[PDB]
Amino acid sequence: LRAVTTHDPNPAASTEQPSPLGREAVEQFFCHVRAQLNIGEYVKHNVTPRETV
């Protein structure tokens, strides 16, 4: 709401700014969820194997 607030009636001189809503949500939450539903990423992220030779 702070990003979409204006301070000038003139459309050319409006003080609207791009909204930082989709970017933060897709970068902080949805990327991990996408990595969760792929088998290679799931194995890479969720298990830490330990082997002794």
Partner 1 sequence: QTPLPVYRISMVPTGQAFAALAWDDWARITRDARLAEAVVSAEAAAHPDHGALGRRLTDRIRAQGPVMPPGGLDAGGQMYVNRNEIFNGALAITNIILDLDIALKEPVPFRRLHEALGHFRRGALAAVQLLFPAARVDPDAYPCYFFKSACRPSPVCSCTDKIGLRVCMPVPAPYVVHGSLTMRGVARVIQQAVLLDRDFVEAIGSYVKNFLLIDTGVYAHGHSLRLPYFAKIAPDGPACGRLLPVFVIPPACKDVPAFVAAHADPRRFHFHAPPTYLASPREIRVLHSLGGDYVSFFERKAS
Contact status: 13 vs partner 1 (CB under 8 A)? no
Q: Are 14 and 6 in contact (CB under 8 A)?
A: yes
Which of 3, 24, 32, 34 binds partner 1 (CB under 8 A)? It is: 32
Q: Give the binding range for partner 1 (CB under 8 A) out of 7-15, 18-26, 29-37.
A: 29-37
The tokens for 43 are 């194995």
Contact status: 30 vs partner 1 (CB under 8 A)? no
Query: 15-25 b/e with 16+ CB inside 10 Å = b?
Result: eeeeeeeeeee
DSSP 11: S
Positions touching partner 1 (CB under 8 A) are 29, 32-33, 36-40, 42-43, 46-53
